Symmetry: C2
Subunit: 174 residues, 2 copies
């Protein structure tokens, strides 16, 4: 189909939250909820970002507001984040939460732990970004997580997100 792109869903057990993640991080894109950065940063230029569950860095921006990323500071090392595509649930575990300046575009590099890399990535990360401190725009709060499990959707939802029901049965795909 034309178009034939897919969206994803993000689930956070710790804060009991979930969203459909749209494509893009412009102001209209993330007005109402989180959005995926379509390109990753490298020193040689922007490159296509990892799709959900895939090697590289799937990065998501959301506003620091009640219905979105206000409570991102509650995440700690070890906490799970689940990303869903059309085929799988991908469970990532938080490996770092930190504060950076707003120009720290390196945090969306394919390997945020090696942003100067000129190699194709091997590990799959998830990064969440939002304004910080609360009610300020001076910094960004960054959560990085690493993939620990890939579950085919045929096996049903992970127990700890199975109560997070959608409003409709429309797919993440056309």
């Amino acid at each position: 189909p034309l178009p034939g792109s897919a969206n994803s869903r993000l689930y956070i057990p710790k804060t009991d939250q979930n969203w459909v993640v749209v494509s893009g991080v412009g102001p209209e894109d993330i007005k109402y909820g989180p959005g995926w950065y379509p390109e990753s940063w490298t020193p040689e230029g922007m490159v296509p970002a990892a799709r959900a569950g895939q090697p590289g860095n799937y990065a998501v921006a959301g506003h620091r507001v009640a219905a979105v990323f206000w409570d991102l500071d509650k995440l700690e090392e070890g906490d799970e984040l689940v990303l869903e595509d059309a085929e799988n649930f991908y469970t990532y575990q938080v490996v770092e939460s930190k504060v950076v300046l707003p120009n720290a575009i390196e945090v969306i590099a394919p390997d945020p732990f090696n942003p100067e890399s000129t190699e194709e990535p091997e590990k799959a990360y998830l990064t969440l970004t939002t304004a910080h401190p609360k009610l300020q725009n001076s910094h960004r709060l960054i959560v990085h997580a690493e993939l620990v499990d890939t579950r085919p959707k045929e096996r049903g939802m992970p127990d700890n997100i199975a109560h997070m029901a959608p409003e409709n049965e429309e797919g993440l795909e056309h």
Copy 2:
């Protein structure tokens, strides 16, 4: 800022319509209005698509419904489309309207009149895509338009879209 991406606005005098164009063409992206295809097709793989007003093919999908692209079939050769970014109004003129099968991904090539090209694009195109016929999903109606004017926003809006007011004063940028 992180994020620092921009959205665009699309205006169509003929049908007296305008929208904020989001990034991406997934189902969630275009649920409520038109979205920009982030990548253009080439025989060697997907590449980054033209940004608004720029050489290549800025392509937009929208559903064939009342508040979006139902009336795309009313556009005729010569009709104007205006795309707005943070700096300019870009006026394009329709050069072709055609019907294709949904797998005709060549219509989002950087040069849709030379889709097999391996060269960088020279001309700036705008392409609109929607399902066709009305109340069917079997085909796609494609409108291609070519850039004819670049107006800096300091000069205000083109006369024929100056009545198309927004609901708020939020920028297309963060």
